Symmetry: C2
Subunit: 56 residues, 2 copies
């Protein structure tokens, strides 16, 4: 998947999002109550964004 990038009026106020596909979200029971801790790590010498579910 490609990143989901949103903008406002002011230049440089853009925000970035990664999608959670429906069936993966459904299989994981992901809800608006969940909390994630984000780490940056290496997977196969490539850059990885890891969201660890910490709450709910």
């Amino acid at each position: 998947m490609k990143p989901y990038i949103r903008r406002g009026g002011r230049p440089g106020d853009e925000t970035y999002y990664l999608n959670i596909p429906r069936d993966i979200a459904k299989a994981l029971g992901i809800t608006k109550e969940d909390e994630f801790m984000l780490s940056v790590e290496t997977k196969d010498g490539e850059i990885t964004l890891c969201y660890k579910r910490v709450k709910k």
Copy 2:
């Protein structure tokens, strides 16, 4: 941090997103054409969503 949940009619026809903080996005040079491969793992015994960049 929490998920960015957007639209839905309620029935699991919702969409789920995880935010990349702007300066992590900037430090990784994230642009709209980057490609990410989503994998699901355990970290400290908790579910982790890992997004590996597979194309810049």
